[PDB]
Amino acid sequence: LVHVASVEKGRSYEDFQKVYNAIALKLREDDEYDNYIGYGPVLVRLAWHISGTWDKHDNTGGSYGGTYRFKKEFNDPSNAGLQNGFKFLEPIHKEFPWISSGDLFSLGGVTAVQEMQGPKIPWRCGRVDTPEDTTPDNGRLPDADKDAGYVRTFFQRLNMNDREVVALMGAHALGKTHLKNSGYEGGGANNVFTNEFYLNLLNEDWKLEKNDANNEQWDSKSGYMMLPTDYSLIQDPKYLSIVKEYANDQDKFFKDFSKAFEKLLENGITFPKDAPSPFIFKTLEEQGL
Numbered sequence: 001l002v003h004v005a006s007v008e009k010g011r012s013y014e015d016f017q018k019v020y021n022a023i024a025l026k027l028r029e030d031d032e033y034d035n036y037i038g039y040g041p042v043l044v045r046l047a048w049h050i051s052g053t054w055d056k057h058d059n060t061g062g063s064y065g066g067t068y069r070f071k072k073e074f075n076d077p078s079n080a081g082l083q084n085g086f087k088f089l090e091p092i093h094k095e096f097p098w099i100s101s102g103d104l105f106s107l108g109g110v111t112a113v114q115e116m117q118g119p120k121i122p123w124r125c126g127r128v129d130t131p132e133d134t135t136p137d138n139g140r141l142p143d144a145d146k147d148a149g150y151v152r153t154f155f156q157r158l159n160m161n162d163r164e165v166v167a168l169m170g171a172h173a174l175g176k177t178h179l180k181n182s183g184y185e186g187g188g189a190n191n192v193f194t195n196e197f198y199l200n201l202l203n204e205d206w207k208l209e210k211n212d213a214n215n216e217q218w219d220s221k222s223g224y225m226m227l228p229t230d231y232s233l234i235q236d237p238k239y240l241s242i243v244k245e246y247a248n249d250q251d252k253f254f255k256d257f258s259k260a261f262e263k264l265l266e267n268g269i270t271f272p273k274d275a276p277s278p279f280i281f282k283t284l285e286e287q288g289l
């Protein structure tokens, strides 16, 4: 099963920068959302969830087809809350109706990371919408109640190794959990992309507590939280080494996250040899906008 990237007709860097800019300007405008977190984090989560359905064994799922627009996927219980991201992107899609859905969802994540002062994430266009019957079944995204061996095995389906897993998890510096969406009680939340997830893991005094949904999570008296799967990164000695590395080197974490997140957003896509090179979008700030 082969998905070949096909550039939206006649489009180039400039076109996709305009789309980036529209998303970025909306991120700035719509600042109230989720107790002033803004939409950055949920856009990153959306990009991950539309990509994280991928299965390396048969090339099903993945970002290419834009299948999140279909009810089966949109109503996946693992996607609860992501409707807010989709709503946010709707006016952008209406303004730029030529962009494919998988391009838009993935670009929303790139834009979010960058505007939140994260690393540059090179991004390639050419995802093509596919029909409703190509929508992956629910149950391909990970559970949060498990341990390190679960996390490791899970991410092998996505072709991610230990370093890639630990780097990608660092996105949990962004935003929070919501009891109503996932059964986890939200803790202190940020909308700036840093290596703080790793610092929190290593430096806080964590207590295993039960929340009001009767699920266990790790909390600190300072008001942070970790999912079981987050905490697993300091329980497993291989993950722990990488946690420490990223807690001690912001730049390395940025570089590794950029590579892993691009890879995640690109899994399943075949880029023709004469496809454009990846785009690196300027932030609003870099443009003086």
Ligand code: HEM
Residues within 6 Å of the ligand: 041, 042, 044, 045, 048, 080, 081, 142, 143, 144, 145, 151, 168, 169, 171, 172, 174, 175, 176, 177, 178, 179, 181, 182, 183, 184, 227, 229, 261
């Ligand atoms: C074992 C892997 C993972 C698990 C079990 C997991 C689980 C969760 C859960 C339970 C939430 C809370 C949802 C809600 O209540 O609204 C969430 C939020 C979030 N996740 Fe993950 N996640 C994982 C990996 C990732 C990855 C790889 C990324 C992206 C690189 C990511 C990005 C985010 C972001 C940015 C949010 C915050 C959303 C917001 O503030 O609305 N997660 N995750």
